[PDB]
Amino acid sequence: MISLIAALAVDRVIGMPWNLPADLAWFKRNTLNKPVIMGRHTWESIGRPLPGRKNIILSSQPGTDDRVTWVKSVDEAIAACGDVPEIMVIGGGRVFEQFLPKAQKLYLTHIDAEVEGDTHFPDYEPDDWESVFSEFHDADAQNSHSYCFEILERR
């Protein structure tokens, strides 16, 4: 099954005006040993394959890096994962919009930061997604903002 994972600021802004090592531990635990699907802009932003994971990059043009697996469509990305329990889509905004209708699980980090960004998470509605887990953490000496881990399953 497909799951989206992302860190959302106010107004669902994504993509780094914060410094959250605790969110990176949450991201690493939830994606480790699972294939990750990302768009090309996300891929160039990270700049390196996420270790311990099959990296699948969506792009309409031929691949330019043999360290990862390149695909040209959503169906081809899903097929490139094979038979795995859970597929993790990690961004960006354009890729999230295509995978939201097919996802059954949302891993969200709600960051209490006002950021004027030009990329947003899709507008998921409460009647389609039911919160099954929530965990707030205050801002501390290592995390620049307060944040809230949430897991939503399709109701």
Ligand X SMILES: NC(=O)c1ccc[n+]([C@@H]2O[C@H](COP(=O)([O-])OP(=O)(O)OC[C@H]3O[C@@H](n4cnc5c(N)ncnc54)[C@H](OP(=O)(O)O)[C@@H]3O)[C@@H](O)[C@H]2O)c1
**The Cα angle at residue 131 between residues 126 and 134, in degrees rounded to 5:** 135
Please provide residue 43's backbone torsions phi and psi, each rounded to the nearest 5 degrees.
-60, -45
Does 80 sit near ligand X (CB under 6 A)?
no
3-state secondary structure of 3: strand
Contact segment (CB under 6 A) with ligand X among 62-70, 89-97, 101-109, 136-144 equals 89-97
Please, which residues bridge with residue 108 across strands?
6, 150
The nearest distance, CB 99 to ligand X, in angstroms, is 9
Contact segment (CB under 6 A) with ligand X among 53-61, 80-88, 99-107, 141-149 equals 53-61
d(CA 154, CA 107) in angstroms, rounded, equals: 12
The nearest distance, CB 139 to ligand X, in angstroms, is 25
In the complex, the residues that contact ligand X under the rule CB under 6 A are 15, 38-42, 44-45, 58-61, 72-74, 91-95, 98, 119
